[PDB]
Amino acid sequence: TYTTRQIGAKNTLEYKVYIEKDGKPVSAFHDIPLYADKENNIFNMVVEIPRWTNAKLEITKEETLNPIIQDTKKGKLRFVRNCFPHHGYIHNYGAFPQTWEDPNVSHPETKAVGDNDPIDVLEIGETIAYTGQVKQVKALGIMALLDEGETDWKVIAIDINDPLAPKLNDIEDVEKYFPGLLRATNEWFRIYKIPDGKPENQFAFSGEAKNKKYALDIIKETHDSWKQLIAGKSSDSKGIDLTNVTLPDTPTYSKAASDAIPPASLKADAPIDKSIDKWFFISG
Amino acid sequence: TYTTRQIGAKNTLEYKVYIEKDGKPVSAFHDIPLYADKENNIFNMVVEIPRWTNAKLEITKEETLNPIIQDTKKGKLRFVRNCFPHHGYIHNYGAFPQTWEDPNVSHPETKAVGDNDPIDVLEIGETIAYTGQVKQVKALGIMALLDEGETDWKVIAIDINDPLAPKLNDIEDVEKYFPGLLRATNEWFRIYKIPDGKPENQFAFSGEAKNKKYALDIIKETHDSWKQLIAGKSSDSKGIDLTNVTLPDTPTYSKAASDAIPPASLKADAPIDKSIDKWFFI
Ligand SMILES: [F-]
Ligand SMILES: [F-]
Ligand SMILES: [Mn+2]
Ligand SMILES: [Mn+2]
Ligand SMILES: [Mn+2]
Ligand SMILES: [Mn+2]
Ligand SMILES: [Mn+2]
Ligand SMILES: [Mn+2]
Ligand SMILES: [Mn+2]
Ligand SMILES: [Mn+2]
Ligand code: NA
């Protein structure tokens, strides 16, 4: 059973959320199995950002056990700005554990190195998720986002517990039951960093949403990249903390790491600067 | 100075927000001047619904002093559903006090009776407002919404404190600085009740957002309607509570009404049913 251990108040630099397995903290990056049900293509998604929120919370690669913390820019807590007609993130945003967008090799489909992070997941279900949540999802498709010139695939997925899950089998179904979502997703990821002073992003395949099988292929490839990483065989692991508590055959396996995590110290959410309210009317 | 007195926890049936003037509750409907600055057409807007929220909070016409209370639905609270690509309300939503969409007569421009409510205001500034807030705004334009067959004008306005207030002077400026907002506004009010089983709404003038001059004329008309109402001279006030504490020449003037209001008893927001998360694709 997966639960969360929160330290500090949300929207602060001290905030951390560790994922616990049966009460004991494990690496949100390496210890949560990619597959919930491999042959049925059911994956374990680690949720980082709830739909319609702004705080850019992320599994941190450089902290032991890889807790979820808020990303920062120029020493300040990072909040993704509101880009009309969107409010914060338009999907429950997260990642697939045990995956890695290898930054050390140019990916052929996108002709760019990976962004050094687990593969990204956009969960489209009706319910708003929570940070640290481990939910089972089925992959429906995938988009080839070039984010700031780096291969940064976005998997389209849905919580298997969603009322519409049974009717969602492949990418075409998303357009049928969530008309306009895929186009909004393409737009969102193209323009969301413009309010930060960054260029518009781009997609390969003219922004086409590749199907479920294509998605599974990329997911599996990133899983293999991670296998090499966790085995300690990457030409450059970028300082990523590979400490894990469930992979005994790995060089960085460490039982002790779990008990070294502080106990929960959850505090009420800290206030967020009113500037984050601002709705930006921008475009590519 | 205007402040708020909150009773109970937000998102519960007991929740009430009264507006206070110098610490004393006053009617949110009748006691707040329509104009903050008449000469410059700067209006006082009573905020009911903060942008991106779902709870359908409204000035209550039938309760003394007209506190803001969440609309109810079959014994429970009423929440507006999320209609893709929108999250709850897409504007700070409220009304102009001392105005009334007369339900007793058909309105020429829309050819329908009014919805019996103060005129509605959409505040487009960047800052998310708060329930019970009295903010000063500039009118930019107006949309002729026919909500479920009733005249239900929607004033487009901007908080005078907004960084863009200086550049926003007439309806055309909304498209210039907030491209797409007006089209989205038209769509929002056309479909927001569909998830509730209601028909799609319609707008007069093909949904055109009339300019400031036009808006000022309609606002003035709803204000004249209220003047008639508050004077006790409407042919039918529809059971609206006309009690006020600042209009001593009105039949329903009663300063004691302020003192009758219980003290603030603010509680933490109550959780909202997760079903309200649902995003509808209409
Ligand atoms: F990432
Ligand atoms: F109304
Ligand atoms: Mn990042
Ligand atoms: Mn990521
Ligand atoms: Mn990225
Ligand atoms: Mn990424
Ligand atoms: Mn109403
Ligand atoms: Mn109203
Ligand atoms: Mn209405
Ligand atoms: Mn109305
Ligand atoms: Na990344």
Coordinates of C-alpha atoms and ligand atoms in Angstrom, one line a residue:
Chain A
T1 CA 0.0 0.0 0.0
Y2 CA 1.3 3.4 -1.0
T3 CA 0.8 6.5 1.1
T4 CA 2.5 9.9 1.4
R5 CA 4.7 11.4 4.0
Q6 CA 4.6 15.2 4.0
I7 CA 7.2 17.4 5.6
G8 CA 6.6 21.1 5.9
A9 CA 4.0 23.4 4.3
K10 CA 3.0 23.3 0.7
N11 CA 4.3 26.2 -1.3
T12 CA 7.6 26.6 0.6
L13 CA 11.2 25.5 -0.1
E14 CA 11.1 23.1 2.9
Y15 CA 8.1 21.1 1.5
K16 CA 8.8 17.5 0.7
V17 CA 6.5 14.6 0.0
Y18 CA 7.9 11.1 0.2
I19 CA 6.1 8.1 -1.0
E20 CA 5.8 5.3 1.5
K21 CA 5.2 1.6 0.9
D22 CA 3.5 0.1 3.9
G23 CA 4.6 3.0 6.0
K24 CA 8.2 3.0 4.9
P25 CA 9.6 5.7 2.5
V26 CA 10.9 4.4 -0.8
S27 CA 12.4 6.2 -3.8
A28 CA 9.6 7.8 -5.8
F29 CA 12.0 7.5 -8.8
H30 CA 13.4 4.0 -8.5
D31 CA 11.4 1.9 -6.0
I32 CA 7.9 2.2 -7.4
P33 CA 7.4 -0.4 -10.2
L34 CA 6.7 1.1 -13.6
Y35 CA 4.2 -1.7 -14.2
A36 CA 1.1 -2.3 -12.0
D37 CA 0.1 -5.0 -14.5
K38 CA 2.6 -5.4 -17.3
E39 CA 0.8 -7.6 -19.8
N40 CA -2.4 -5.5 -19.5
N41 CA -0.3 -2.4 -19.9
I42 CA -1.3 -0.9 -16.6
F43 CA 1.2 1.5 -15.1
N44 CA 1.9 3.1 -11.8
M45 CA 1.8 6.9 -12.2
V46 CA 3.4 9.0 -9.6
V47 CA 1.3 12.2 -9.4
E48 CA 3.2 15.5 -8.8
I49 CA 0.8 18.3 -9.9
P50 CA -3.0 18.3 -9.4
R51 CA -5.1 19.6 -12.2
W52 CA -5.7 23.3 -12.2
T53 CA -2.8 24.1 -9.7
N54 CA 0.4 26.1 -10.4
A55 CA 3.1 25.1 -8.0
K56 CA 5.6 23.1 -10.2
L57 CA 6.1 20.2 -7.8
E58 CA 8.5 17.5 -9.1
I59 CA 10.1 14.2 -8.0
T60 CA 13.6 15.6 -7.2
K61 CA 16.5 13.7 -8.7
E62 CA 19.2 15.0 -6.4
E63 CA 17.7 14.1 -3.0
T64 CA 17.8 10.7 -1.3
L65 CA 14.7 8.7 -2.0
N66 CA 13.7 11.4 -4.5
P67 CA 10.9 13.1 -2.6
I68 CA 8.6 15.4 -4.4
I69 CA 9.5 19.0 -3.8
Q70 CA 8.8 22.3 -5.5
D71 CA 11.0 23.2 -8.5
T72 CA 12.8 26.5 -8.3
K73 CA 14.2 29.1 -10.7
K74 CA 16.8 31.7 -9.7
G75 CA 16.4 30.7 -6.1
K76 CA 12.6 31.2 -6.1
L77 CA 9.7 28.7 -5.8
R78 CA 8.5 28.0 -9.3
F79 CA 4.8 28.4 -10.2
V80 CA 3.6 27.8 -13.7
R81 CA 1.6 30.8 -14.9
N82 CA -2.0 30.8 -16.1
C83 CA -2.3 31.0 -19.9
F84 CA -5.8 31.7 -21.2
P85 CA -8.0 29.8 -21.5
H86 CA -6.2 27.5 -19.1
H87 CA -6.0 27.6 -15.3
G88 CA -2.7 26.1 -14.1
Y89 CA -2.1 22.6 -15.4
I90 CA -5.0 21.2 -17.4
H91 CA -4.2 17.6 -16.5
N92 CA -3.1 15.8 -13.4
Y93 CA 0.6 15.9 -14.1
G94 CA 3.2 13.4 -13.1
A95 CA 5.6 10.8 -14.2
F96 CA 6.2 7.0 -14.5
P97 CA 8.7 5.8 -12.0
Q98 CA 11.7 3.7 -13.3
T99 CA 11.9 5.6 -16.6
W100 CA 14.5 8.1 -17.8
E101 CA 14.7 10.5 -20.8
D102 CA 18.4 9.8 -21.4
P103 CA 20.2 13.1 -21.8
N104 CA 23.3 11.3 -23.1
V105 CA 22.0 10.2 -26.5
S106 CA 20.1 12.0 -29.2
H107 CA 16.7 10.4 -29.6
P108 CA 16.1 9.5 -33.3
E109 CA 12.3 10.3 -33.3
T110 CA 12.9 13.8 -31.9
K111 CA 16.5 14.3 -32.8
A112 CA 17.4 15.7 -29.4
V113 CA 18.8 14.5 -26.1
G114 CA 16.3 13.6 -23.4
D115 CA 15.5 16.0 -20.5
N116 CA 17.1 13.8 -17.9
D117 CA 13.9 13.1 -16.1
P118 CA 11.4 10.2 -15.8
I119 CA 8.9 10.2 -18.7
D120 CA 6.1 12.6 -18.2
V121 CA 2.5 11.6 -17.8
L122 CA -0.8 13.6 -18.3
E123 CA -3.7 11.8 -16.5
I124 CA -7.0 13.0 -18.0
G125 CA -9.5 11.5 -15.6
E126 CA -12.3 13.6 -14.0
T127 CA -11.0 13.5 -10.4
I128 CA -8.2 15.9 -9.4
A129 CA -5.3 13.9 -8.1
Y130 CA -3.0 14.7 -5.1
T131 CA 0.8 15.1 -5.0
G132 CA 2.6 11.9 -4.1
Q133 CA -0.4 9.8 -5.2
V134 CA 0.4 6.6 -6.9
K135 CA -2.4 5.7 -9.3
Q136 CA -2.8 3.0 -11.8
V137 CA -3.3 4.3 -15.4
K138 CA -3.5 3.0 -18.9
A139 CA -1.6 4.7 -21.7
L140 CA -3.7 6.0 -24.5
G141 CA -1.2 7.8 -26.6
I142 CA 1.8 10.1 -26.5
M143 CA 3.0 13.4 -27.9
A144 CA 6.6 14.3 -28.9
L145 CA 7.2 17.6 -27.2
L146 CA 10.5 19.3 -27.8
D147 CA 10.7 21.3 -24.5
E148 CA 13.5 23.9 -24.7
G149 CA 15.1 21.8 -27.4
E150 CA 15.0 18.5 -25.4
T151 CA 13.1 15.3 -26.0
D152 CA 10.3 15.5 -23.5
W153 CA 7.5 13.1 -24.4
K154 CA 4.1 13.5 -22.8
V155 CA 2.1 10.3 -22.2
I156 CA -1.6 10.6 -22.4
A157 CA -3.2 8.4 -19.7
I158 CA -6.2 7.8 -17.7
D159 CA -6.8 6.5 -14.2
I160 CA -8.2 2.9 -14.5
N161 CA -10.7 3.9 -11.8
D162 CA -12.2 6.6 -13.9
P163 CA -15.8 6.1 -15.0
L164 CA -14.8 6.4 -18.7
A165 CA -11.7 4.2 -18.4
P166 CA -13.5 1.1 -19.9
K167 CA -14.5 3.2 -23.0
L168 CA -10.9 4.6 -23.5
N169 CA -8.7 2.1 -25.4
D170 CA -6.6 4.2 -27.7
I171 CA -5.8 7.8 -28.6
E172 CA -8.8 8.3 -30.9
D173 CA -11.0 7.6 -27.9
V174 CA -9.6 10.7 -26.1
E175 CA -10.9 12.9 -29.0
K176 CA -14.2 11.2 -28.8
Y177 CA -14.9 11.6 -25.1
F178 CA -12.7 14.6 -24.4
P179 CA -13.1 16.6 -27.6
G180 CA -10.6 19.5 -27.8
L181 CA -8.4 18.2 -25.0
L182 CA -5.5 17.0 -27.2
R183 CA -5.4 20.3 -29.1
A184 CA -5.5 22.2 -25.9
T185 CA -2.7 20.0 -24.6
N186 CA -0.6 20.8 -27.7
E187 CA -1.2 24.5 -27.2
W188 CA -0.6 24.4 -23.4
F189 CA 2.9 22.8 -23.7
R190 CA 3.8 25.0 -26.6
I191 CA 3.1 28.3 -24.7
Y192 CA 3.3 27.6 -20.9
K193 CA 6.8 28.9 -20.5
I194 CA 6.3 32.0 -22.5
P195 CA 5.1 33.9 -19.4
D196 CA 8.5 32.9 -18.0
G197 CA 10.3 34.7 -20.8
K198 CA 11.1 31.5 -22.7
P199 CA 10.4 30.7 -26.4
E200 CA 7.4 28.7 -27.5
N201 CA 8.1 25.0 -27.5
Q202 CA 7.6 22.6 -30.5
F203 CA 6.3 19.1 -31.2
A204 CA 7.6 16.5 -33.6
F205 CA 5.1 14.9 -36.0
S206 CA 3.4 18.3 -36.3
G207 CA 2.1 17.7 -32.7
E208 CA 0.3 14.5 -33.7
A209 CA -0.8 12.4 -30.7
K210 CA 0.8 9.0 -31.4
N211 CA -1.2 5.9 -30.4
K212 CA -1.2 3.5 -27.4
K213 CA 1.3 1.1 -29.0
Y214 CA 3.6 3.9 -30.0
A215 CA 3.3 5.2 -26.4
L216 CA 4.1 1.8 -24.9
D217 CA 7.2 1.6 -27.1
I218 CA 8.6 4.9 -25.9
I219 CA 7.6 4.2 -22.3
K220 CA 9.5 0.9 -22.5
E221 CA 12.5 2.5 -24.1
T222 CA 12.7 5.1 -21.3
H223 CA 12.3 2.2 -18.8
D224 CA 15.4 0.5 -20.4
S225 CA 17.3 3.8 -20.1
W226 CA 16.5 3.7 -16.5
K227 CA 17.6 0.1 -16.1
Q228 CA 21.0 1.1 -17.4
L229 CA 21.0 4.2 -15.1
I230 CA 20.0 2.2 -11.9
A231 CA 22.5 -0.5 -12.8
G232 CA 25.1 2.3 -12.6
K233 CA 26.0 1.9 -16.3
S234 CA 25.1 5.3 -17.7
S235 CA 28.0 7.3 -19.2
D236 CA 26.8 10.2 -17.1
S237 CA 24.0 9.9 -14.4
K238 CA 24.1 13.7 -13.9
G239 CA 24.3 13.5 -10.2
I240 CA 21.0 11.8 -9.9
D241 CA 20.7 10.1 -6.5
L242 CA 20.2 6.4 -7.3
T243 CA 19.7 5.4 -3.7
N244 CA 16.9 2.8 -3.6
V245 CA 15.5 0.5 -0.9
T246 CA 13.9 -2.3 -3.0
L247 CA 16.4 -3.2 -5.7
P248 CA 19.0 -5.3 -3.8
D249 CA 21.0 -6.2 -6.9
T250 CA 21.8 -2.5 -7.6
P251 CA 25.1 -0.8 -6.5
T252 CA 23.1 1.9 -4.7
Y253 CA 20.7 -0.3 -2.9
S254 CA 20.4 0.9 0.7
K255 CA 18.0 -0.5 3.4
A256 CA 19.0 2.3 5.9
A257 CA 18.0 5.1 3.6
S258 CA 14.3 4.6 4.5
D259 CA 14.7 4.9 8.2
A260 CA 16.8 8.1 7.7
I261 CA 13.8 10.0 6.4
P262 CA 12.3 12.4 9.0
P263 CA 8.8 11.6 10.2
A264 CA 5.8 13.5 8.8
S265 CA 5.5 17.2 9.8
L266 CA 2.6 18.3 7.6
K267 CA 1.7 21.9 8.0
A268 CA -1.1 24.0 6.4
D269 CA -0.5 25.2 2.9
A270 CA 1.6 28.4 2.9
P271 CA 0.1 31.4 1.0
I272 CA 0.9 31.9 -2.7
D273 CA 1.8 35.4 -4.0
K274 CA -1.3 37.0 -5.6
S275 CA 0.7 37.5 -8.8
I276 CA 0.1 33.8 -9.6
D277 CA -3.6 34.7 -10.1
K278 CA -2.7 36.5 -13.3
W279 CA -4.1 35.2 -16.5
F280 CA -1.7 35.6 -19.4
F281 CA -3.1 36.1 -22.8
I282 CA -0.2 34.8 -25.0
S283 CA 0.4 32.6 -28.0
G284 CA 3.0 31.2 -30.3
Chain B
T1 CA -14.6 51.2 4.8
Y2 CA -16.2 48.0 3.6
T3 CA -15.4 44.7 5.2
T4 CA -17.1 41.3 5.5
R5 CA -18.6 39.4 8.3
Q6 CA -18.5 35.6 7.7
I7 CA -20.9 33.2 9.4
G8 CA -19.9 29.6 9.4
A9 CA -17.7 27.7 6.9
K10 CA -17.5 28.3 3.2
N11 CA -19.2 25.5 1.2
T12 CA -21.9 24.7 3.9
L13 CA -25.5 25.6 4.1
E14 CA -24.9 27.8 7.2
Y15 CA -22.4 30.0 5.4
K16 CA -23.3 33.7 5.1
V17 CA -21.2 36.7 4.3
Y18 CA -22.5 40.1 5.2
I19 CA -20.9 43.3 4.0
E20 CA -20.0 45.8 6.7
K21 CA -19.6 49.5 6.6
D22 CA -17.4 50.8 9.4
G23 CA -18.0 47.5 11.2
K24 CA -21.8 47.6 10.8
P25 CA -23.7 45.2 8.6
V26 CA -25.5 46.9 5.8
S27 CA -27.6 45.6 2.9
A28 CA -25.4 44.2 0.1
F29 CA -28.3 44.8 -2.2
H30 CA -29.6 48.3 -1.2
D31 CA -27.1 50.0 1.0
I32 CA -23.9 50.0 -1.1
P33 CA -24.0 53.0 -3.5
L34 CA -24.1 52.0 -7.1
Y35 CA -21.5 54.7 -7.8
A36 CA -18.1 55.0 -6.1
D37 CA -17.6 58.1 -8.3
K38 CA -20.7 59.1 -10.2
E39 CA -18.9 61.8 -12.3
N40 CA -16.4 59.3 -13.6
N41 CA -18.8 56.4 -13.7
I42 CA -16.8 54.4 -11.3
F43 CA -19.0 51.7 -9.8
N44 CA -19.1 49.7 -6.6
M45 CA -19.2 46.0 -7.5
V46 CA -20.2 43.5 -4.9
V47 CA -18.2 40.3 -5.6
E48 CA -20.0 37.0 -5.0
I49 CA -17.9 34.4 -6.9
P50 CA -14.1 34.5 -7.2
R51 CA -12.7 33.5 -10.6
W52 CA -12.2 29.8 -11.0
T53 CA -14.4 28.7 -8.2
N54 CA -17.7 26.7 -8.5
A55 CA -19.8 27.5 -5.4
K56 CA -22.8 29.6 -6.7
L57 CA -22.8 32.2 -4.0
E58 CA -25.3 35.0 -4.4
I59 CA -26.6 38.1 -2.7
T60 CA -29.8 36.7 -1.0
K61 CA -32.8 38.8 -2.0
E62 CA -35.1 37.2 0.6
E63 CA -32.9 37.5 3.7
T64 CA -32.5 40.7 5.8
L65 CA -29.5 42.8 4.7
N66 CA -29.2 40.4 1.8
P67 CA -26.1 38.5 2.9
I68 CA -24.2 36.4 0.3
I69 CA -25.3 32.8 0.6
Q70 CA -24.7 29.8 -1.5
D71 CA -27.6 28.9 -3.8
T72 CA -29.2 25.6 -2.9
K73 CA -30.2 22.6 -5.0
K74 CA -32.4 19.8 -3.7
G75 CA -31.4 20.2 0.0
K76 CA -27.8 20.6 -0.9
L77 CA -25.4 23.3 -2.2
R78 CA -25.4 24.4 -5.8
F79 CA -22.1 24.3 -7.7
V80 CA -21.6 25.4 -11.3
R81 CA -19.9 22.6 -13.2
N82 CA -16.6 22.8 -15.1
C83 CA -17.2 23.1 -18.8
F84 CA -14.1 22.5 -20.9
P85 CA -11.9 24.4 -21.4
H86 CA -13.1 26.4 -18.4
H87 CA -12.5 25.9 -14.7
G88 CA -15.6 27.1 -12.7
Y89 CA -16.2 30.8 -13.4
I90 CA -13.8 32.5 -15.8
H91 CA -14.3 36.0 -14.3
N92 CA -14.7 37.5 -10.9
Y93 CA -18.5 37.3 -10.7
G94 CA -20.8 39.6 -8.9
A95 CA -23.3 42.4 -9.3
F96 CA -23.9 46.2 -8.9
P97 CA -25.9 47.0 -5.8
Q98 CA -29.0 49.2 -6.1
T99 CA -29.9 47.7 -9.5
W100 CA -32.7 45.4 -10.4
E101 CA -33.6 43.4 -13.6
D102 CA -37.3 44.1 -13.4
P103 CA -39.3 40.9 -13.7
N104 CA -42.6 42.7 -14.0
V105 CA -42.0 44.1 -17.5
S106 CA -40.6 42.9 -20.7
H107 CA -37.3 44.6 -21.8
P108 CA -37.2 46.1 -25.3
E109 CA -33.7 45.0 -26.3
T110 CA -34.1 41.4 -25.2
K111 CA -37.9 41.1 -25.4
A112 CA -38.0 39.2 -22.1
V113 CA -38.7 40.1 -18.5
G114 CA -35.7 40.6 -16.2
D115 CA -34.4 37.8 -13.9
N116 CA -35.4 39.7 -10.8
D117 CA -31.8 40.2 -9.6
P118 CA -29.3 43.1 -9.4
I119 CA -27.5 43.5 -12.7
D120 CA -24.6 41.1 -13.2
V121 CA -21.0 42.1 -13.5
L122 CA -18.0 40.2 -14.9
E123 CA -14.7 41.7 -13.5
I124 CA -11.8 40.8 -15.7
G125 CA -8.8 41.9 -13.8
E126 CA -5.9 39.7 -13.0
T127 CA -6.4 39.3 -9.2
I128 CA -8.9 36.7 -8.0
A129 CA -11.5 38.5 -5.8
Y130 CA -13.1 37.4 -2.6
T131 CA -16.8 36.9 -1.7
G132 CA -18.3 40.0 -0.1
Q133 CA -15.6 42.2 -1.5
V134 CA -16.7 45.7 -2.7
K135 CA -14.3 46.8 -5.4
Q136 CA -14.4 49.9 -7.6
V137 CA -14.7 49.2 -11.3
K138 CA -14.8 50.9 -14.7
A139 CA -17.6 49.6 -17.0
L140 CA -16.2 48.5 -20.4
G141 CA -19.2 47.0 -22.1
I142 CA -22.2 44.7 -21.7
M143 CA -23.6 41.4 -23.2
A144 CA -27.4 40.8 -23.6
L145 CA -27.6 37.3 -22.2
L146 CA -31.0 35.6 -22.2
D147 CA -30.6 33.2 -19.3
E148 CA -33.3 30.5 -19.5
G149 CA -35.5 33.0 -21.4
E150 CA -34.9 36.0 -19.0
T151 CA -33.2 39.3 -19.6
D152 CA -29.9 38.8 -17.8
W153 CA -27.3 41.4 -18.9
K154 CA -23.7 40.8 -18.1
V155 CA -21.6 43.9 -17.6
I156 CA -17.9 43.6 -18.5
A157 CA -15.8 45.6 -16.0
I158 CA -12.3 46.1 -14.7
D159 CA -11.1 46.8 -11.2
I160 CA -9.7 50.3 -11.1
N161 CA -6.7 48.9 -9.2
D162 CA -5.8 46.5 -12.0
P163 CA -2.4 47.2 -13.7
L164 CA -4.3 47.4 -17.0
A165 CA -7.1 49.6 -15.8
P166 CA -5.6 52.7 -17.4
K167 CA -5.5 50.9 -20.8
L168 CA -9.0 49.5 -20.6
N169 CA -11.6 52.2 -21.4
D170 CA -14.1 50.7 -23.8
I171 CA -15.2 47.2 -24.9
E172 CA -12.7 47.1 -27.9
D173 CA -9.9 47.2 -25.4
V174 CA -11.0 43.9 -23.9
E175 CA -10.2 42.1 -27.2
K176 CA -7.0 44.1 -27.5
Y177 CA -5.6 43.1 -24.2
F178 CA -7.6 39.9 -23.4
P179 CA -8.0 38.3 -26.8
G180 CA -10.5 35.5 -26.8
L181 CA -12.0 36.5 -23.4
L182 CA -15.2 37.9 -24.9
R183 CA -15.8 34.8 -27.2
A184 CA -15.1 32.6 -24.2
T185 CA -17.5 34.7 -22.1
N186 CA -20.2 34.2 -24.7
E187 CA -19.6 30.5 -24.8
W188 CA -19.4 30.2 -21.0
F189 CA -22.8 31.7 -20.4
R190 CA -24.3 29.7 -23.3
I191 CA -23.3 26.3 -22.0
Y192 CA -22.7 26.5 -18.2
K193 CA -26.1 25.2 -17.2
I194 CA -26.2 22.4 -19.8
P195 CA -24.6 20.0 -17.3
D196 CA -27.5 20.8 -15.1
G197 CA -30.1 19.7 -17.6
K198 CA -30.9 23.2 -18.8
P199 CA -31.1 24.3 -22.5
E200 CA -28.2 26.2 -24.0
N201 CA -28.7 30.0 -23.4
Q202 CA -28.8 32.7 -26.1
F203 CA -27.8 36.3 -26.5
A204 CA -29.4 39.2 -28.2
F205 CA -27.4 41.1 -30.8
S206 CA -25.7 37.8 -31.9
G207 CA -23.7 37.9 -28.7
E208 CA -22.1 41.2 -29.5
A209 CA -20.6 42.9 -26.5
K210 CA -22.1 46.4 -26.6
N211 CA -19.8 49.3 -25.7
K212 CA -19.5 51.4 -22.5
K213 CA -22.0 54.0 -23.6
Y214 CA -24.6 51.3 -24.2
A215 CA -23.7 49.6 -20.9
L216 CA -24.1 52.8 -18.9
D217 CA -27.6 53.3 -20.3
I218 CA -28.6 49.7 -19.3
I219 CA -27.0 50.1 -15.9
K220 CA -28.9 53.4 -15.4
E221 CA -32.1 51.6 -16.3
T222 CA -31.6 48.8 -13.8
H223 CA -30.7 51.5 -11.2
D224 CA -34.0 53.3 -11.9
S225 CA -35.8 50.0 -11.6
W226 CA -34.2 49.5 -8.2
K227 CA -35.1 53.1 -7.1
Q228 CA -38.7 52.2 -7.8
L229 CA -38.4 48.9 -6.0
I230 CA -36.7 50.3 -2.9
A231 CA -39.2 53.1 -2.7
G232 CA -41.9 50.4 -2.4
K233 CA -43.3 51.6 -5.7
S234 CA -42.9 48.4 -7.8
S235 CA -46.2 46.7 -8.6
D236 CA -44.6 43.5 -7.2
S237 CA -41.4 43.3 -5.3
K238 CA -41.5 39.5 -5.5
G239 CA -40.9 39.0 -1.7
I240 CA -37.5 40.7 -1.9
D241 CA -36.4 41.9 1.5
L242 CA -36.1 45.7 1.1
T243 CA -34.8 46.3 4.6
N244 CA -31.9 48.8 4.5
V245 CA -30.0 50.8 7.1
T246 CA -28.8 53.8 5.0
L247 CA -31.9 55.0 3.1
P248 CA -33.9 56.9 5.7
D249 CA -36.6 58.0 3.3
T250 CA -37.5 54.5 2.2
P251 CA -40.5 52.6 3.8
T252 CA -38.3 49.7 4.8
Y253 CA -35.6 51.8 6.5
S254 CA -34.6 50.1 9.8
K255 CA -31.1 50.8 11.3
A256 CA -31.8 48.1 13.9
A257 CA -31.4 45.5 11.2
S258 CA -27.6 46.0 11.4
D259 CA -27.6 45.2 15.1
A260 CA -29.7 42.2 14.6
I261 CA -27.0 40.4 12.7
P262 CA -25.0 37.8 14.8
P263 CA -21.3 38.3 15.2
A264 CA -18.7 36.7 12.8
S265 CA -18.2 33.0 13.4
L266 CA -15.8 32.2 10.6
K267 CA -14.7 28.6 10.2
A268 CA -12.3 26.9 7.9
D269 CA -13.6 26.1 4.4
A270 CA -15.5 22.9 4.3
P271 CA -14.5 20.3 1.7
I272 CA -16.4 20.2 -1.6
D273 CA -17.7 16.9 -3.1
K274 CA -15.0 15.5 -5.5
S275 CA -17.7 15.2 -8.2
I276 CA -17.4 19.0 -8.6
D277 CA -13.9 18.3 -10.0
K278 CA -15.5 16.8 -13.2
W279 CA -14.8 18.4 -16.4
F280 CA -17.7 18.4 -18.9
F281 CA -17.2 18.4 -22.6
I282 CA -20.3 20.1 -24.1
Ligands
F1 F 10.5 15.9 -16.6
F2 F -28.6 37.5 -11.1
MN3 MN 11.5 20.4 -15.0
MN4 MN 8.8 15.6 -15.4
MN5 MN 9.7 19.7 -19.7
MN6 MN 10.1 16.1 -18.7
MN7 MN -29.2 33.0 -9.7
MN8 MN -26.7 37.8 -10.3
MN9 MN -28.6 34.2 -14.7
MN10 MN -28.7 37.5 -13.3
NA11 NA 12.3 17.7 -16.8

